[PDB]
Amino acid sequence: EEIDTRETQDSETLDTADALEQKEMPEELPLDASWDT
Amino acid sequence: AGGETVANWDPHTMPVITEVSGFVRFTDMIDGQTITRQTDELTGLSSLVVLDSAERTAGGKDLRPALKIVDAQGNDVLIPGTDMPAQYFLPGKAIVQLEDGVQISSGDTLARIPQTGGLPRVADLFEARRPKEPAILAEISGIV
């Protein structure tokens, strides 16, 4: 089956200040670590 | 001596001042157009008050009202080191307390117009981001 996909994908261009501005939590941690460290 | 106060300012209203003294002559000042009789609502002790650029008439808005400082004899006082007299183009909301031909002292108020942190701050500093209401700087030395 095939379904539509139009959701935006985050990339590196998101500036460091904007990361701290956002209240939401990132989908995947940029840092090479798990969700416990 | 130690623990001695040697400064006291009241910057709630901008103190535009003149080094020279003398009478105040109203150049390019016309009642109703640029200046007006803004009698104080409680005491009435005031003078021909300059209106704001937008508040006054458009014809007077184009005109530049100035409070030139002359001597006690009416002769225009030239600014020291320059041929131009003591010319002062008042900005808007300029409350004039000195009537026409009123002697003044050195340093007199011609116009009486009033007046982050943490990690996101570090990220903003390292991303070199321009702020809101940036300070305006002079690009090259010269007379304004």
DSSP notation for B65-134 = -EEEEB-TTS-B-BPTTSSSBB--B--SS----S-TT----SS--S---B---HHHHHHHHHHT---SSP
Q: Are strands B66-69 and B24-27 parallel, antiparallel or unpaired?
A: antiparallel
CA distance A13 to chain B (A): 12
Residues contacting residue B102 through CB under 8 Å, at least 6 positions apart: B23, B24, B47
Decide if A15 touches B, using CB distance below 8 A.
yes
- 10 Å Cβ neighbour count for B136? 6
In which element (H, E) is residue A21 found?
Answer: helix A16-21
| B126–A15 C-beta distance less than 8 A | no
Which positions in chain B touch A21 (Cβ < 8 Å)?
120
Dihedral of CA B15/B20/B23/B24: which sign?
negative
Q: Is B51 left (phi over 0), alpha (psi -120 to 50) or beta?
A: beta
Cβ–Cβ < 8 Å for B133, B84: no
What is the CA B59 to chain-centroid distance, rounded? 21
Distance CA A18, CA A28 (A): 16
Residues contacting residue B68 through CB under 8 Å, at least 6 positions apart: B24, B25, B26, B27, B76, B85, B86, B87, B88
| B127–A16 C-beta distance less than 8 A | yes
Beta bridge partners of B70: B76
Distance CA B104, CA A4 (A): 80
A6, amino acid identity: R
Instruction: Please name the method used to determine this structure.
Output: cryo-EM
Q: What are phi and psi of B113, to 5 degrees?
A: -75, 130
Distance CA B95, CA B62 (A): 19
| B129–A16 C-beta distance less than 8 A | no
Both tokens of B101, joined, read 């031909």
Resolution of the model in angstroms: 2.7
| B126–A16 C-beta distance less than 8 A | yes
Give the residue among B90, B93, B104, B89 at the shortest CA–CA distance from B19.
B104
Beta bridge partners of B48: B37
